[PDB]
């Protein structure tokens, strides 16, 4: 399985700035 | 190096053959397979091919343009090309996989 996006663009402006946190620290932001 | 998931981030798709959109999807899939499965040489050939550039940009400000893929109408005798002004792969539908690696492995193989 493993289902991941295969585009240039998942959202526009969802998630806000969560999606830029390092991956060691992205349990700690939401959205 | 070149990153599968890197190279996803900011690859976009045409579409010329005119094929359905189940077949498509799993097609992207197949392609996707394909460039997560050779080695450090061939993923560079690849992006020379595509860029014209052994390494991928670390951010996707400075891309002139954006890399995208057109998907000719289906030839299994015909190699697929690049425009590396603009970083367009033109690549044909290849219903059959296995001609889908060779030739793509054919393609990037030259320099």
Known sequence: ????????????????GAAQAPRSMQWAVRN | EVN???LISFTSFN????????????????????VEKMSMTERQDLVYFWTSSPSLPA???????????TIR????????????????L??????????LKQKLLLAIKTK
Not at chain 2, 15 to 34: H, M, P, T, V, Y
Not at chain 2, 74 to 83: G, K, M, R, S
Not at chain 2, 90 to 99: A, F, G
């Open chain 2, 59 to 69: 951010s996707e400000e400075g891309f002139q343009p954006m890399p995208s893929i």
């Open chain 2, 15 to 34: 579409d010329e053959s005119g094929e359905n959109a189940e077949k498509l999807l799993q097609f992207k899939r197949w392609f996707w397979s394909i």
């Open chain 2, 4 to 6: 599968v998931q890197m």
């Open chain 1, 1 to 16: 399985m493993l289902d991941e996006p295969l585009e240039r663009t998942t959202n526009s402006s969802h998630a806000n």
């Open chain 2, 90 to 99: 033109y690549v044909p539908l290849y219903s059959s996989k296995q001609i």
């Open chain 2, 73 to 88: 109408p289906p030839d299994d005798q015909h190699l697929p090309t690049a425009n590396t002004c603009i970083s367009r």
